[PDB]
C-alpha cells in the first residue's frame, strides 16, 4: 500500500462521512466517491496534495448537476411553468416569488391556482398575486384541477401573457398517493408545459432520490428550485433529487418574503454541502 494510495483512501473516507452527514443519498455518495477515487489514482512520484484532491471533488460534484450559469429567461413566449413537489415544500409561495422575479424583469405574468385540495389554496395564491400586482386565475368552486389549469393557461395565452405559472397540490406519490402521480402526469399531458419545476425543501433526507425519481417517471422534471436555504440544512438531499432527475437547478428560496428568490450558484452550493 503506497503512501499515496493511503492518502487517497483516508481522503475518500472523510469525504464519504461529510457527504452522508450533509444528507446526500448514501448509495450515491459511494458511487460518486468511487469515481473520484479512481480519478485521484489515475490522474496527476508525488504524494498527497489535498488542494488537488479538493479540486477534483468540486469538479466531479459540479458535473453532477452542470457547471454553466442557469438560463432563467424563457426560450420562447408564452412560456408555461408547472410547479410540483411534496406537501409543504414551498410551491405556492415560490409561484409568487417567480411571478415577482419575472414582473420585475418586465414580463406580463399570470398565476394559475390549480390546487383544489388544500384549504384556502386559492385564497393564498390570490393574496400573493394581489401583493405583487400579478393577475391570478382560479375557480374555488371547481374540483377538477386539470380543468382549472387548462382554462387558466388558455385565458392567459389569449391575453398575451409572457409567462404563465401553474401552482399544483402537494403530493409525495407513495401508498394511496400513487394516484396523485397519475393525476400529475395527466395534467402534464394536457398542459404540455415548457418547464416542470420540482420545488424541494432544502432539509429533505434520504427519501429524496427515490421520491424525485417517482416524480420524474410521472412527469419529466426540467428544473429544480431549492427552498428554505435560509435555514441550517446542508442541502444534500436536494442534490440527490437533482441527480435522480437530471434536472437543472435554477433558483433557491432564501426566506418567506416575496422577493427572497435568487439564481442558483453551483460553487457555493458545493461548498455548503462541504
Amino acid at each position: 500500500s503506497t503512501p499515496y494510495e493511503k492518502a487517497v483512501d483516508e481522503f475518500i473516507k472523510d469525504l464519504q462521512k461529510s457527504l452522508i452527514s450533509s444528507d446526500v443519498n448514501v448509495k450515491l455518495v459511494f458511487s460518486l466517491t468511487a469515481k473520484i477515487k479512481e480519478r485521484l489514482n489515475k490522474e496527476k512520484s508525488v504524494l498527497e496534495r489535498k488542494e488537488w484532491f479538493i479540486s477534483i471533488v468540486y469538479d466531479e460534484l459540479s458535473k453532477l448537476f452542470g457547471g454553466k450559469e442557469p438560463n432563467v429567461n424563457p426560450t420562447k413566449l408564452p412560456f408555461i411553468i408547472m410547479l410540483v413537489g411534496v406537501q409543504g415544500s414551498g410551491k405556492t409561495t415560490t409561484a409568487g416569488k417567480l411571478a415577482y422575479f419575472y414582473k420585475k424583469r418586465g414580463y406580463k405574468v399570470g398565476l394559475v391556482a390549480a390546487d383544489v385540495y388544500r384549504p384556502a389554496a386559492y385564497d393564498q395564491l390570490l393574496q400573493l398575486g394581489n401583493q405583487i400586482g400579478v393577475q391570478v386565475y382560479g375557480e374555488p368552486n371547481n374540483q377538477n384541477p386539470i380543468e382549472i389549469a387548462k382554462k387558466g393557461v388558455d385565458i392567459f395565452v389569449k391575453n398575451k401573457m409572457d409567462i404563465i405559472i401553474v401552482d399544483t397540490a402537494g403530493r409525495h406519490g407513495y401508498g394511496e398517493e400513487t394516484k396523485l402521480l397519475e393525476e400529475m402526469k395527466e395534467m402534464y399531458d394536457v398542459l404540455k408545459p415548457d418547464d416542470v419545476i420540482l420545488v424541494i425543501d432544502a432539509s429533505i433526507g434520504q427519501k429524496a432520490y427515490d421520491l424525485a425519481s417517482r416524480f420524474h417517471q410521472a412527469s419529466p422534471i426540467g428544473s429544480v428550485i431549492i427552498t428554505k436555504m435560509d435555514g441550517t440544512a446542508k442541502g444534500g438531499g436536494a442534490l440527490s433529487a437533482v441527480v435522480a432527475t437530471g434536472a437543472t437547478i435554477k433558483f433557491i428560496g432564501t426566506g418567506e418574503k416575496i422577493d427572497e428568490l435568487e439564481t442558483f450558484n453551483a460553487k457555493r452550493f458545493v461548498s455548503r454541502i462541504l
Partner: protein
C-alpha cells in the same frame, strides 16, 4: 461451551446496521454513537456455539432502541388533559415553515372531539397568506370555534383573546397555531417567546417533518435551547419515511414523539409506540 464475542465477529453486521439506520434518517452522529454503544455492550459477552452472532447483534440493537424510546415516554396527552384541573388546557404548536402545524392542529381537534373534550383554536399565525382562512375551513368542518382576534391583532393578542374566551365558556382545550419560523431567526423566535409569555401554555409541541434528514435534529436542538418544548409530533410519515428522527430525539434530547401524522385527513394521526417504530425500521 459458549463462544466469546470479539470485535472481529461484529464488523460486518455493524456496517449493515449502520447503513440501515442512516437510510432510516437516523443522523450520522447518532448512528455512530448507538453502534459504538452496541459494540461495547457485546465485546466480551458469551454466546452459544451454534448461535448466529449476527442475530444476537440485531436483537440486542432492537432491544436497546426499544428501551431508549420506552424510557422517554410520558403520560398520554388525553389523560394529561383529563387529569388537569385547568380550563382551558392550553397547547401551542410551533416549528419551521411548511412542516404541518396547521393541519396537525385540525387532527388534534378531531382526536379531542372523539374523546369528548371541547376545543377552540387560536389563529395566531397572523403573517402568512391565507393562514386564517385555511384554519377557518378546518374549524368550520370540525364544527369548533376559531378565534381570529380583532382586526390586525398580533399573535399574542389573538392567543390572549382565545384563552379569555375559553375561560368564560369553560372550554376544555385551547390549541394555538403559530406561523412557520426558522429556529435561527432571532426576531421570529422572539415573537414566539412573546406568545408563550402571554399564553403560558400547559403543553408545547414542536412539529417536525419526517421526510427531513439531519436538519430535523438540528431544528429540535435549537428550539429546545431557545424556546423549550414538551413533545414532538412527526408528520408525513405516509411518504414512506422511516422517521429515524424519533430515535435521535430520545437519544440526544430526551424528547418524546407523542403522535405521528400519516396523511391529510383528520383521522390521519396515530400515537407513537416504540414497538411500532422498531418494526418500521427493521421491517
Amino acid at each position: 461451551k459458549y463462544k466469546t464475542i470479539k470485535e472481529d465477529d461484529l464488523n460486518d453486521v455493524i456496517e449493515e446496521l449502520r447503513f440501515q439506520l442512516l437510510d432510516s434518517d437516523v443522523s450520522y452522529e447518532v448512528t455512530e454513537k448507538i453502534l459504538e454503544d452496541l459494540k461495547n455492550n457485546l465485546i466480551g459477552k458469551k454466546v452459544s456455539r451454534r448461535e448466529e452472532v449476527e442475530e444476537i447483534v440485531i436483537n440486542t440493537l432492537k432491544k436497546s432502541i426499544t428501551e431508549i424510546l420506552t424510557k422517554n415516554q410520558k403520560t398520554d396527552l388525553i389523560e394529561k388533559i383529563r387529569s388537569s384541573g385547568k380550563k382551558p388546557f392550553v397547547i401551542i404548536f410551533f416549528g419551521v415553515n411548511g412542516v404541518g402545524k396547521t393541519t396537525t392542529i385540525a387532527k388534534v381537534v378531531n382526536m379531542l372531539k372523539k374523546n369528548n373534550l371541547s376545543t377552540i383554536i387560536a389563529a395566531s399565525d397572523t403573517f402568512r397568506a391565507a393562514a386564517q382562512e385555511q384554519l377557518a375551513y378546518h374549524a368550520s368542518k370540525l364544527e369548533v370555534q376559531l378565534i381570529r382576534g380583532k382586526y390586525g391583532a398580533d399573535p399574542a393578542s389573538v392567543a390572549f383573546d382565545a384563552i379569555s374566551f375559553a375561560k368564560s365558556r369553560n372550554i376544555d382545550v385551547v390549541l394555538i397555531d403559530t406561523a412557520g419560523r426558522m429556529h435561527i431567526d432571532s426576531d421570529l423566535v422572539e415573537e414566539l417567546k412573546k406568545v408563550l409569555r402571554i399564553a403560558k401554555p400547559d403543553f408545547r409541541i414542536l412539529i417536525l417533518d419526517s421526510l427531513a434528514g439531519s436538519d430535523a435534529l438540528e431544528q429540535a436542538r435549537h428550539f429546545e435551547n431557545n424556546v423549550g418544548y414538551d413533545a414532538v409530533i412527526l408528520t408525513k410519515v405516509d411518504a414512506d419515511a422511516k422517521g429515524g428522527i424519533a430515535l435521535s430525539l430520545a437519544y440526544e434530547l430526551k424528547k418524546p414523539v407523542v403522535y405521528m401524522g400519516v396523511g391529510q385527513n383528520y383521522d390521519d394521526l396515530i400515537p407513537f409506540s416504540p414497538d411500532w417504530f422498531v418494526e418500521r425500521i427493521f421491517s
